[PDB]
Design a binder for this molecule. Structure first.
Ligand SMILES: [Mg+2]
Length: 132
């Protein structure tokens, strides 16, 4: 266990973290999720990312620092959760995950839950701090 990197902003609080992890889990089961920094980057480049989740304890943190920049340029919501171990479990994997992307599906059974998370993230972004 490690504390969130100072560059890991915005950081979802405990409540938002659980909300995010639960949606990530449902997205994993519905195969509406991409895992890893590279796969996440590609969803952004393709415009198929509803939102990006990153681990604040990613080490080294540099491997994912391009994501906040990319999301800001693409107007895509992004947030950091405190644990890569927890995000890994939510992704339905026995390994830590440092980045994940919930992909687009307007007919998704969990569309409303994804939209709810997006709105929460967007509100956080409005409250200061940008990577640019
Ligand atoms: Mg830019």
């Amino acid at each position: 266990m490690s504390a969130p990197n100072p560059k890991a902003f915005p950081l979802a609080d405990a409540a938002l973290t659980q909300q995010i992890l639960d949606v990530v889990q449902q997205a994993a089961n519905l195969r509406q999720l991409k895992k890893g920094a590279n796969e996440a980057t590609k969803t952004l480049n393709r415009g198929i990312s509803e939102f990006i989740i990153m681990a604040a304890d990613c080490e080294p943190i540099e491997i994912l620092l391009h994501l906040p920049l990319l999301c800001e340029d693409k107007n895509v919501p992004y947030v950091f959760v405190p644990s890569r171990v927890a995000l890994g479990r939510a992704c339905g994997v026995s390994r830590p995950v440092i980045a994940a992307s919930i992909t687009t599906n307007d007919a998704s059974a969990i569309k409303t839950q994804i939209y709810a998370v997006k709105d929460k993230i967007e509100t956080l972004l409005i409250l200061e701090h940008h990577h640019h």
